[PDB]
Enzyme design. Sequence first.
Site, PDB file in Angstrom:
ATOM      1  N   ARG A  15      68.763  47.815  67.258  1.00 16.15           N
ATOM      2  CA  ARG A  15      69.979  48.558  66.965  1.00 16.15           C
ATOM      3  C   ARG A  15      69.612  49.953  66.413  1.00 16.15           C
ATOM      4  O   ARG A  15      68.448  50.218  66.175  1.00 16.15           O
ATOM      5  CB  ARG A  15      70.807  47.828  65.935  1.00 16.15           C
ATOM      6  CG  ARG A  15      70.046  47.593  64.644  1.00 16.15           C
ATOM      7  CD  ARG A  15      70.989  47.153  63.522  1.00 16.15           C
ATOM      8  NE  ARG A  15      70.264  47.013  62.253  1.00 16.15           N
ATOM      9  CZ  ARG A  15      69.413  46.023  61.955  1.00 16.15           C
ATOM     10  NH1 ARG A  15      69.178  45.025  62.811  1.00 16.15           N
ATOM     11  NH2 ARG A  15      68.789  46.026  60.781  1.00 16.15           N
ATOM     12  N   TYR A 140      64.926  56.682  48.149  1.00 21.30           N
ATOM     13  CA  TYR A 140      64.750  57.563  49.320  1.00 21.30           C
ATOM     14  C   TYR A 140      63.575  58.514  49.134  1.00 21.30           C
ATOM     15  O   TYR A 140      62.704  58.594  50.014  1.00 21.30           O
ATOM     16  CB  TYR A 140      66.002  58.329  49.593  1.00 21.30           C
ATOM     17  CG  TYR A 140      65.882  59.411  50.686  1.00 21.30           C
ATOM     18  CD1 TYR A 140      65.902  59.069  52.045  1.00 21.30           C
ATOM     19  CD2 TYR A 140      65.805  60.729  50.345  1.00 21.30           C
ATOM     20  CE1 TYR A 140      65.830  60.016  53.044  1.00 21.30           C
ATOM     21  CE2 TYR A 140      65.678  61.700  51.330  1.00 21.30           C
ATOM     22  CZ  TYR A 140      65.709  61.366  52.672  1.00 21.30           C
ATOM     23  OH  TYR A 140      65.686  62.422  53.592  1.00 21.30           O
TER      24      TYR A 140
END
Lengths: 233, 253, 244, 239
Positions: A15, A140
């Site tokens: 995906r 992150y």
Amino acid sequence: MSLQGKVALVTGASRGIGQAIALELGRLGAVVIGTATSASGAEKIAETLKANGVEGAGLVLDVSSDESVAATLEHIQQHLGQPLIVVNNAEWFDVVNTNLNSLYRLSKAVLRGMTKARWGRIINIGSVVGAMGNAGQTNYAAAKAGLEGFTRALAREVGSRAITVNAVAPGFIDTDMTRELPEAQREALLGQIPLGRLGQAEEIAKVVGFLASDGAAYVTGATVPVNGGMYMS
Amino acid sequence: HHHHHHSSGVNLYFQSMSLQGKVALVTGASRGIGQAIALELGRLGAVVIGTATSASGAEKIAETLKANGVEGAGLVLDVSSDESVAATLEHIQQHLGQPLIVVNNAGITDEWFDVVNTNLNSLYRLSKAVLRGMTKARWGRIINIGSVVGAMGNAGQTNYAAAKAGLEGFTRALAREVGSRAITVNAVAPGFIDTDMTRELPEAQREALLGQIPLGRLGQAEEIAKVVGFLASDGAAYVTGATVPVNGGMYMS
Amino acid sequence: FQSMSLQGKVALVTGASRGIGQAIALELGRLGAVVIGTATSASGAEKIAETLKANGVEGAGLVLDVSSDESVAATLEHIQQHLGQPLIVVNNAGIVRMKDDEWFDVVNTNLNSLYRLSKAVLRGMTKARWGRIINIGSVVGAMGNAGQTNYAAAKAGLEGFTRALAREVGSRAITVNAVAPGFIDTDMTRELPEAQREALLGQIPLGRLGQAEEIAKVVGFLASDGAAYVTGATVPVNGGMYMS
Amino acid sequence: SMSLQGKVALVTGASRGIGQAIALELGRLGAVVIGTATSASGAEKIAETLKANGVEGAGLVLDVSSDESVAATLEHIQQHLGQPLIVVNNARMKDDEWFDVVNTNLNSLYRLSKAVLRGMTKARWGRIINIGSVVGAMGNAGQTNYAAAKAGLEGFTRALAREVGSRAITVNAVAPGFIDTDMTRELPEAQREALLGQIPLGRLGQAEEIAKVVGFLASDGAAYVTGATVPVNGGMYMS
Ligand SMILES: c1ccc(-c2nc(N3CCOCC3)c3sccc3n2)cc1
Ligand SMILES: c1ccc(-c2nc(N3CCOCC3)c3sccc3n2)cc1
């Protein structure tokens, strides 16, 4: 710019970004092996490749497992050929530690074949921004710092063999963390992005396709940010 | 007379041609990297305006474009001059159209402050000038080319690092400024590139140099040009504020 | 011979009339330097001279415009004649709501002025074969995107300028460093609605604004003999709030 | 002002070079110093060094690779001296071993940091200061290793700072360049010369020059510095 005659392995191809990457490398003429952690994900990949006219396979691979990595590579080598383009797309401390140990496991395994060919492309895909707040920013930034340094170092180690090692660091890309946001949150987010929009998975894939090409032969140890001008560290 | 505008001269549709006649301006196109960029953008289907500071350079560019079947022109432009930039852009707009791809490769060479200052001021002058046309089109590509490593020793290292730091920050800041208009601003930072200077190094000195580069070879001008080409493309539309190092793994700061 | 002491040294601190610069002037004074603080106005120079006196620091308040070759030359001549050669120089004199197109002119002006002063004070340091140049970055000047663009551009410029100048002058035992503040307790901070103050404090791991004195203590340390091997560095003083 | 009176400091790898210098500098500032070594004989030497410099504290054996060693050492210190609220982590090369070196070193930083954070969290105050590697190892492998370790330390330090900042604990790093130690002192002359030529200051750094930076970072004057890596390299930046 074309990849006819090359075999590409793309991990986490079922995906979003991984799937887009698989399709792009296929479009450029590669034979593509996409992987997922489940049989259902592998089947989805095989159907997707078939539907788009790409030769290759959908395989189950767990990058956290030495056994799964060795077994999957041996299977690929026997049935399709040696992958010369490898795209890695499969609290902060345990996440980074696990992820870099996986990158190292897979890279070492595929490097024998690349060394035999005297040619290779390893392309490591960073994590998208996963959450808005401070924990999100910490995670992150740590993952990206790890990826950048890992990439630079492996590039040094394999460069004499005409193997390049690069990374692609996506910002906010149109996927499910973003697709589930309240409008007030989406608007605030878009305000931090100079281009004023989320990135598409295909926009990461196009960068990967270029890195995989012969035109990028002198690019190594680089991390290409794909973030519409939104820089966080 | 010195003539300052030279045309290329101008039914095979090459698959590579995707820029559909967009006008590209490449500063400092008469040799090396700039020339390679001009050719790569031509291979990609742009109308290419390459510049030099002299009429003889502008003529050499036009001959190169001609020999390679690229539509466009060789023009005189001095990026250090407001008058030259204004007059030349107006000339381009009147005769060829609005440049929507602009590659800044022109640049001059204890020196470090005046070099970086002059160079960033030039990038800013030209960039601001082309932005009206890009804003009107709601599309643009500004690509800034860094300086190659120019010398082996400490002054060289200081210059190279100071230029690169200036270029990286500049690029990021201008990208922030012009992003809402779907203009991207990126940089390419070359390492050691095979030029006339590096071919003429003694073998012991070339060997020592190659030892600092993981790939074990100097880069080709065309390898810079391919990266530029990519950044100019629709596929790089989400890449902005970035500096792409093209250095064979040789990272100096 | 004592750790941290600046006795016998003359320090020039540009932009010393308030906030960070004033705190720096007082910290260097506390450490024993003779401190010349500057402002762009006679009023600001008088405030400096009164502040130094009140705190028992020897030195002076002078009017200096770092944008002017004549002002820089005159100021250095005054100092040399009356107090001696400044061997510690601290640069804190940077120049409709803020927009994201202002970064170029601001950075260009500030680095040009920094180069002008630094080149001028280098002759004396070069002669002495010792020096400290310490460049202070600009605090975050506005909330939101233009604020971030402008802060980041200034910080990037100052980092690179600092590293290059350090390289140029290092063989003479002159160090060149920067201090890059984050959010410091100042007026843009005061003007914010409480919801906005709270959000601001949420981007800072320490959960508070920095104090001017917290910048000044870093500067004092860089000025010291113990920091002799630190050069070309930018020290961030931002409570963990990193943005570029 | 610069004083650390009333504070307990733990300095790992304190029996020589930069660790020793750090121990002595924190002691000069008034801290009680627990310095560690991997052997009993190293621990005893630490204790004798402290005594010889008028520093209160102790030498101890610690293996930062071992959860058991770390837990046992901290329990000892807490029982006899108090909670360390200042912790300084200081304790050919191959072209393909950089990964295992960085991995091991960061896993050890994390292990010791997480263990001392409990006490600092209780106190709502702390200083964690991580010391990077010294420049010098031979060849491309040395450069690869140095650069990877440095990048790892910088990111690790920035992330841990973010994690613990709300507790008024700072976390910072010091990244040394070419420093005069037992390990650099006798490198081959051609290598020493090449490195000196890359250094603007034109000299090696002293261990004490690293220690002074650590001392500053441990002070109350550095309370707004967190997540920073301070390069101490005489202007020689290697990446
Ligand atoms: C050494 C010498 C000069 C510079 C520098 N950097 C700048 N910038 C713009 C903001 O982003 C960073 C660089 C800018 S902007 C106008 C001038 C200027 N100069 C940097 C290093
Ligand atoms: C080359 C080789 C390895 C690394 C690296 N960086 C890390 N970091 C970087 C800082 O962010 C925390 C995690 C971490 S965390 C656990 C392992 C690890 N490894 C970096 C460069």
